[PDB]
Ligand binder design. Structure first.
Ligand code: NA
Length: 224
């Protein structure tokens, strides 16, 4: 197989697509979601290669810019309005651009994760979305009064586990929350650390909202 970077810098991110193949299963991705697959300060972008039906891969790593709006947070491909955020990201990773890793594998999220959490002393709490079970870990650590973690677990056809935790361990430090998401969407595994520049505690609505956008996005790639 041969790689090509024949596409221009995007204006919207939707002007071209690239076709990928996971052992026969195709995914067609608007090229603005592929900022890591570029050359020369994001002036040459990955393109379908003549004579090759698809890029045969084991994983795809898309990159999305996340942005606050009046209607929530939204995810964007590279475009002329947000490009400076991607340029910073490509230099040192230090901007509001998240990576989402897509593979094609059988789901291995536990259908009994919540039961396990209960056995560990993590407690169930009310959920804003009935299809998610919510849990809060407030277990006591004498040396770490800041220990605090949340889980939001979805089952169904496309299960997901969202973990949101305070990374602060001392008193001079500030609160610094981070998030992990593991999920299975339409036969794919989709794993990511969203909101990478946010240190503030995020609500269930912010976290589930992001994941709903990711589910729609990944599904749009196999609608083609
Ligand atoms: Na690659």
């Amino acid at each position: 197989e041969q790689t090509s970077f024949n596409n221009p810098e995007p204006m919207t991110g939707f002007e071209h697509t690239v076709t990928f193949d996971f052992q026969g299963t195709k995914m067609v991705i608007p090229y603005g979601y592929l900022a890591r697959y570029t050359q020369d300060n994001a002036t040459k972008w990955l393109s379908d290669t003549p004579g090759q039906d698809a890029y045969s891969i084991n994983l795809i790593e898309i990159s999305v810019y996340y942005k606050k709006t009046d209607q929530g947070w939204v995810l964007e491909p590279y475009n002329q309005q947000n490009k400076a955020h991607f340029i910073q990201f490509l230099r040192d990773g230090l901007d509001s651009v998240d990576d989402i890793v897509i593979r094609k594998d059988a789901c291995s999220l536990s259908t009994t994760m919540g039961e396990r959490l209960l056995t560990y002393g993590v407690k169930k709490m009310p959920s804003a979305y009935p299809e998610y079970e919510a849990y809060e870990d407030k277990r006591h650590i004498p040396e770490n009064p800041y220990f605090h973690e949340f889980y939001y677990i979805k089952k169904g056809e496309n299960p997901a586990i969202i973990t949101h935790r305070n990374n602060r361990i001392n008193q001079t430090e500030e609160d610094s929350y981070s998030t992990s998401v593991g999920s299975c969407i339409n036969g794919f595994t989709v794993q990511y650390y969203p909101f990478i520049r946010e240190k503030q505690q995020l609500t269930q609505q912010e976290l589930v909202g992001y994941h709903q956008q990711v589910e729609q996005l990944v599904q749009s790639f196999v609608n083609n």
